[PDB]
Amino acid sequence: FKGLDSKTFLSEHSMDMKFTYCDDRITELIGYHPEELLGRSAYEFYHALDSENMTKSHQNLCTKGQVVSGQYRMLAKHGGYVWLETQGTVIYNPPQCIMCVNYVLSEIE
């Protein structure tokens, strides 16, 4: 059994959804090293069956400024999928980047 902090990690993305930063906590949870994620869009990692609903959530983030994802799957480093829920927040300046708080709902399946 894991405590809440240990199932939660932060990520940052450009407005193109590419990772620009990720907490090292992801490595124990999903297997990626943060540096291998940089430059890759979140869309490279969504299960096919979640792709249309995530595209709708991204649209909503970009119109509302802040959205919770609902339950979705991320492709894990060595195959299979982890269920996550994410709260997304756009940081607008003087949009600059998206900040994500990600919470893991399952082990790798």
Partner 1 sequence: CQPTRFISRHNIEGIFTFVDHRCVATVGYQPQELLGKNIVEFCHPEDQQLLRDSFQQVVKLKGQVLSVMFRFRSKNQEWLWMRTSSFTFQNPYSDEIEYIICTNTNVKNS
Ligand X SMILES: O=[N+]([O-])c1cc(S(=O)(=O)C(F)(F)F)ccc1Nc1cc(F)cc(Cl)c1
Residue 81 binds ligand X, judged by CB under 6 A = no
Residues 90, 65: contact at Cβ < 8 Å? yes
Closest C-alpha among 58, 67, 109 to residue 87: 67
- Give the Cα separation of 98 and 100 in Å (integer): 6
State in angstroms the smallest separation of the CB of 3 from partner 1: 30
CA distances from 85 to 11, 88, 94, 95, 104 (A): 13, 10, 30, 23, 7
Residue 82 binds ligand X, judged by CB under 6 A = no
**Of residues 68 and 91, the one with the C-beta less far from ligand X:** 68
Residue nearest to ligand X (CB): 88
The site for partner 1 (CB under 8 A) is made up of 16, 41, 43-44, 48-49, 51-52, 55, 75, 79
Residue 32 binding partner per list ligand X, partner 1, none, with a CB distance cut-off of 5 to 8 Å that depends on partner kind:
none
In DSSP terms, 97 is beta-bridged to 91
Q: Which of 42, 50, 81, 104 binds ligand X (CB under 6 A)?
A: 42
